[PDB]
Amino acid sequence: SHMSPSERQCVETVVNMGYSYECVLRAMKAAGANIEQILDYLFAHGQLCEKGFDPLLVEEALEMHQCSEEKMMEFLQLMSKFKEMGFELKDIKEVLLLHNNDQDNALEDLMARAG
Amino acid sequence: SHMSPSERQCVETVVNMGYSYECVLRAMKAAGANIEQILDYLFAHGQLCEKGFDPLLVEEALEMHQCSEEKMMEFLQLMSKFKEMGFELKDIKEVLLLHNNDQDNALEDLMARA
Ligand SMILES: [K+]
Ligand SMILES: [K+]
Ligand SMILES: [K+]
Ligand SMILES: [K+]
Ligand code: NA
């Protein structure tokens, strides 16, 4: 197998917890071959989708903010807002990262390039 | 320029704090285009190299453990120790990650596969 021994151990254990292979493999690609990190990703991804967030934006938020749930949520909410205004995702990520999720600074930057 | 406006802003600001372009671009690639993130990476990388850690291993530790400075140090120390014992970096990273930096479990794993 192309997988390492630790990768296979993660898949075996998390699939035993009741997750599909596809979900586990995707989560492990994102979160790394550690069981708690995979489960935390799977649970957070599920909870956020259930709240109505776009799964693509959820995935961006989980990648961008691995350390703070509070910052992750702030990033997710503002990314959702700016995306619904019509800005491009690549620009939104960039300005939220530069400005530490400050809504006013991020918007000022996005507008300066809106067209 | 191939860089985004935010990337250019970071380079301009950080080079102004007296860092070389090459150091800033490398740090930005690792840490992302946010000035505090770049400065924190540059400073940590410097401090750990000054303590005598292999810069290649320092870079692996800064990548693996962005959230906990204590976890980052514990990983860096163990990766250095296991490398001295003669194990391969790729294996070492894998077992330290799986076993949450537990030395004995990681070691038993490494010896078992060797
Ligand atoms: K890997
Ligand atoms: K963070
Ligand atoms: K890593
Ligand atoms: K961490
Ligand atoms: Na990100």
Numbering used by the authors:
A (entry chain B): 386 to 500
B (entry chain A): 386 to 499
Copy out sentences from the published article reporting this entry, exactly as the authors wrote them:
Here we show that ubiquitin associated protein 1 (UBAP1), a subunit of human ESCRT-I, coassembles in a stable 1:1:1:1 complex with Vps23/TSG101, VPS28, and VPS37. The X-ray crystal structure of the C-terminal region of UBAP1 reveals a domain that we describe as a solenoid of overlapping UBAs (SOUBA). NMR analysis shows that each of the three rigidly arranged overlapping UBAs making up the SOUBA interact with ubiquitin. UBAP1's function is exclusively required for degradation of ubiquitinated endosomal cargo but not for other ESCRT-I-mediated processes such as midbody abscission or viral budding.
Two constructs covering the UBAP1 C terminus, residues 381–502 and 389–502, produced ample protein but did not crystallize. One of these mutants, with 415-KKGE-418 mutated to AAGA, readily crystallized. The 1.65 Å resolution crystal structure of the UBA-containing C-terminal region from UBAP1 has two molecules in the asymmetric unit that are linked to each other through a disulfide bond. However, multiangle laser light scattering indicates that the molecule is a monomer in solution (data not shown). It appears that the disulfide-linked dimer is formed as the protein oxidizes during the crystallization process. The structure shows a single domain consisting of seven α helices arranged as a right-handed solenoid that contains three overlapping UBAs (UBA1, UBA2, and UBA3). The relationship of the SOUBA fold to conventional UBAs can best be described by regarding the third helix of one UBAs being also the first helix of the next UBA. The solenoid arrangement of the three UBAs forms a convex surface containing helices one and three from each UBA. The opposite face forms a concave surface built from the second helix from each UBA. The residues showing the greatest perturbation lie along the convex face of the SOUBA domain and cover an extended hydrophobic surface.
